[PDB]
Design a protein around this ligand. Structure first.
Ligand code: NAG
Length: 111
């Protein structure tokens, strides 16, 4: 059951949607906001605030903020597939001072 530090787990049935919460600090409010998916030593872009999106998620992923809450962004992923399962990282900013949040998506799929 090893996880990255302070991981938020989301559990969804196949074909449903998930809204991932990505907290950050004021220092990174002006910076790029992104979600990426872990591979063992790579994190592959899912979507970022420059409107770049992974072809495997286009039409299914949306990145937004809400109200005047200046300290959190959201990524909704719809039409979940078993291949969407796994670890993701939220990032606000770039480099050593970036705010990161570890996320684990569990997708329950047919036997
Ligand atoms: C997304 O899932 C929520 C449950 O968290 C549900 O209320 C909502 O209707 C779903 N939206 C779509 C477009 O499937």
């Amino acid at each position: 059951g090893g996880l990255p530090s302070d991981t938020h787990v989301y559990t969804k049935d196949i074909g449903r949607n998930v809204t991932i919460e990505c907290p950050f600090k004021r220092e990174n409010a002006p910076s790029k906001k992104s979600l990426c998916k872990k591979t063992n030593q790579s994190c592959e872009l899912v979507i970022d605030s420059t409107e770049k999106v992974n072809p495997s998620y286009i039409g299914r992923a949306k990145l937004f903020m809400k109200g005047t809450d200046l300290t959190v962004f959201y990524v909704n992923i719809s039409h979940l597939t078993h291949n969407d399962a796994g670890l993701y990282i939220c990032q606000a900013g770039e480099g050593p001072s970036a705010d990161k949040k570890n996320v684990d998506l569990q997708v329950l799929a047919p036997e």
